[PDB]
Structure formats: C-alpha cells, structure tokens
Amino acid sequence: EEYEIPEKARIKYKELLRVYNNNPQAVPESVFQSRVARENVEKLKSGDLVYFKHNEKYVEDIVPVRISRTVDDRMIGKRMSADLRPCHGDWVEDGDLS
C-alpha cells in the first residue's frame, strides 16, 4: 500500500522546512532543536521517515514529528475576495506564470 505525493504536498512541506529554520523564538542551543532545524533541511529526500495524512489514493499533509505545524494549502491571497486583492498583483493560482 503506497500513496502518491502531489506537487501541492511537496510545496507545503518545503514551506514547513523554512518555518522551522527561520524561527526567531528558536532555542539558542542547536542540540535542543529538532533534526529539521538543526541540520537545516531544505528538501524532502529518499529514505526519510515522516508522518503523512492521506485520502484514498493521494496524500494530503506531511510532518517531520508527531506534533508539528499545519501548513496551509492556499496562499493568503485566496483567503480574501478576489475583488479585494490588488488590481495589479501576484499570481496565486496553481502553476507558474514563468
């Protein structure tokens, strides 16, 4: 039994990594920090042990530890009305305009 990792879940996990690393309230001692914070993990590689949430065939969320952070699956631009967003702004949809 295996489940597929969509590009959405990888982006959420990569956002989770930079939140752990760039923590202004992180403990001064790197020994007390987690493995994600101590080794400065910036990508998900093979052989990594994680906790994942899946529905049917696909996976939804990935966390490094038992109790961790829930990264939002949307940009904050989608959490306001599209009329209230800047008239000329940025791209908050799926895919890259590049």
Partner: peptide, 13 residues
C-alpha cells in the same frame, strides 16, 4: 535516521 534497518524487540498489549 533509518539509513540502515534495525531489528528490535517490541512488546504490545
């Protein structure tokens, strides 16, 4: 980090 699998004794109830 689990690079090498390890056999250990586990007890369940």
């Amino acid at each position: 980090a689990g690079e090498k699998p390890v056999r250990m004794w586990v007890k369940r109830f």
